[PDB]
Symmetry: D2
Subunit: 261 residues, 4 copies
């Protein structure tokens, strides 16, 4: 509709993790609303295919320009400058208006009894240090105002942990805590978290392989909706946050009712 369109037409949106899954669907919604979308990822092959997919999305507002950049989020010595370059690129000729930091990763970490300091800090680098640094650099490329937003991603497993996942559960709690600290330190910019549940992404399919349909019966049994989330469903939550200039400091839970059980 025109008011959603006017909320976001011509606005720059950076989507870290936009190659597939939730980020890609956010990118689709962004350009359907007339916004400029910059997607970032770790894989140039994946990034290239996602980028053409967006350019010829038939529901793309013709006005929407799509661009891409490759950014390595585990390279500690160059992380701040890589992130600084990404934001420069995303700002382009003006300023960034909305940042989405997606987290679509769940690879079970080693057993607690074997975890190492190196392993701990790697998850933190990706889950904690990088979002902090984007916040540090952000005022150069984005106006701190409530028309703009910076959105992070945690997960329902922060509240309902699976056994074997304590390192990841811990940094998920850290993302939600970081959001709250940043909502104060970056005011009047709006900072929020989306906390998704089980989402049926292509990589989720591929991981589970033959084990897919078992895991999905579990997730449906655990939900109250009785069905697995579409990435398109979850992406609406990030778009809502862009539109509502009143929402900041909160964790938006879109997880099929699993948290009720």
């Amino acid at each position: 509709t025109r008011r959603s369109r006017d909320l976001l037409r011509g606005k720059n949106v950076l989507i870290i993790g936009g190659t597939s899954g939730i980020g890609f669907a956010v990118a689709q919604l962004v350009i359907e609303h007339g916004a400029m979308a910059c997607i970032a990822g770790s894989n140039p092959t994946k990034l290239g295919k996602a980028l053409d997919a967006l350019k010829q999305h038939p529901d793309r507002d013709p006005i929407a320009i799509v661009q891409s950049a490759t950014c390595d989020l585990f390279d500690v010595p160059n992380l701040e400058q890589n992130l600084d370059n990404l934001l420069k690129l995303a700002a382009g000729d003006s300023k960034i208006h909305h940042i989405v930091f997606t987290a679509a990763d769940m690879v079970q970490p080693p057993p607690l009894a074997s975890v190492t300091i190196e392993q701990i800090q790697r998850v933190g680098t990706i889950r904690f240090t990088a979002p902090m640094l984007v916040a540090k650099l952000l005022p150069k490329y984005m106006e701190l105002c409530p028309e703009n937003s910076y959105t992070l991603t945690s997960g329902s497993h922060a509240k309902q942990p699976d056994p074997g996942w304590s390192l990841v559960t811990g940094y998920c709690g850290g993302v939600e805590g970081l959001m709250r600290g940043l909502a104060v330190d970056m005011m009047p910019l709006r900072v929020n978290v989306v906390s998704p549940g089980a989402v049926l992404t292509p990589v989720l399919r591929d991981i589970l392989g033959d084990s897919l349909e078992i895991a999905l019966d579990a997730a449906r049994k655990k939900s109250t909706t009785g069905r697995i989330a579409r990435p398109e469903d979850v992406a609406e939550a990030y778009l809502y946050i862009m539109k509502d200039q009143n929402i900041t400091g909160t964790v938006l839970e879109t997880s099929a009712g699993m948290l009720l059980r």
Copy 2:
């Protein structure tokens, strides 16, 4: 966008409290999307005015049709019947797809030291008994599926009480509890709560108006009073995200951080 119109075009939406404030702005957004709005109020003049305000809305979709229906939420002997009639109207010739229960809920109650049992029960009737009775009657007019949603309203004062408001704080906590119980008992229907704060509505606003606003602006991190149209986007979002159920969506300008 086409995606959003496709989700809501032709859907029956009941806004309880749609004559003014957030409910009115929710009615606006849903008719922009081609949905069939039915607004309910307690004041017939206010209704007719709002109903007419809506029917003339500029961005209104031509196919969107608006109706109104009076319903006193405090008349306990007739409450179940009025809600049943209201539900029957909003369904029309098919079914209701989305129910929004909004409230302009901020008139301060009597002091704790003086509050009486009928005063407690009167807030209990509007805040708790009425949403429960909508839930009781809802399956007759509405399918229990995750395409559909039923959204209640609490408020940031549920978490940040002001002195004098303990009775309204309590029943806000009851609204949020009720939502979670209903999200289970009525599954796979989706049931949620929107918890607004720092929104300026006509009824809310006159001379003291700008004192309290400054208390909200200073308490917030947006440094800005919010328009009903901002908060309305939360109700619309819940209608669209067929994954969201059982949660309290907090749109209150960052006041909860401070």
Copy 3:
């Protein structure tokens, strides 16, 4: 210091005849406090009262008394609560109040619920604790040394199918606590939210099915076992001692909330 926080203090336990309330009363008199238990059945009150006077670990100075109070009789509710508070104040003032949960049985289906049924839950779970708060200042100093503790339940967050009315009022108790923590400051007001506790009442209800239900609860927990009333009663005693804690919901529910 911590040994004398409770010695000589006047405690009121509403629902002190069995289960959690009774175990609170036990801990209270072990610490030397004066306990007034309230309940709805004079015979069960009588049994509870004797069992507390006879408690071997009761501090000698600790005096126990009882009072009957129908929390569903609306026309007499405010006066009955006033009389209960007068009693518990003894010859000085109340210092701590505990209000244990109704622990009701499953209500009728949602499609069957009536206004009368809704308000009856509200009377016991919301109106009665509200009226205690209204009346309290006449009999009790509003200060951080004293405390007023309500009771919700882990099913406030994890609803059981068919219980929406009880789940709703459980969230009302928690909201009321927060409202009261503000309107009654600097008195401390808190909520204990217990999970699966094996009270004597419970074992009668489940009866033959008890071992099924206890393996279910154990499976949902991370402790792997069912809580004792004496375990949960430690939380109420804690709140009485920590003069810094107010406005919060204390969750003691075996880790079920992690699942």
Copy 4:
């Protein structure tokens, strides 16, 4: 010190990481009043001296309670896992540890967000997150996983009420709470919990910053270390409580 409370703790081994001062010291007091064996740990050796001597000469101490100390620097990364392992081995002694308390890293404002560096981010995490993570790694070697025992971590009210300039600390306080829940599952049926204190007056802290907290609270006063210490003791005794954040912060969270 009731018989019921002493039975629960008498003879138990309790490790208190950060027991030299403040909340940790007060927990050490309460546990030895119960006849439990307290082992305190600290970064500063003669600050341990003070504490260790002060503890040992406490008036309400159960005659049978023993006290002992150890140093452990939670920032020295090359030596962190071993010093923690050595610490745990000490507290277990000739049996097992029964209760662990990890008292929080203190409230020193970090650099302004605009100037924070990766080295700065990672050192708050080493102490607030890595160290308790490593204690959990090593614990099973020295502690039984049963609901009679507990591992208690510490976050803080600023996890939910940030102050300007504290985003890094608020960040890892949420990490501590998330870690507690994950460990509450991974280490079941051991009980793991978080105490979240607020408005607490300790000597390293101890008038404008003290009236300011009083105005945000509903108790209207600054709480003592001895009040919040009761929370840690409660969690030891309630064999039903796990996976939760116990908020003892004077009602500041209501405002």
